[PDB]
Structures are given as C-alpha cells and as structure tokens.
C-alpha cells in the first residue's frame, strides 16, 4: 500500500496546488 499511499500524496499536492491557487486567484 506504499504506492498507494504515494499515489494519493502526489494527488494530495495537486489539490493543493489547486487549492493555493484557487484562493490566490
């Protein structure tokens, strides 16, 4: 489950990203 916790980590920074993204702009 180490790849699937990497999957969703890497998913996880992505809706981060969005999410500082989104509520800079």
């Known amino acids: ?3 699937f916790m990497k999957g969703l ?3 996880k920074e ?3 990203a ?3 993204k ?3 702009g």
């Open 14 to 16: 992505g809706v981060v």
């Open 18 to 20: 969005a999410a500082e």
């Open 22 to 24: 989104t509520k800079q």
């Open 1 to 3: 489950m180490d790849v």
């Open 9 to 11: 980590s890497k998913a």
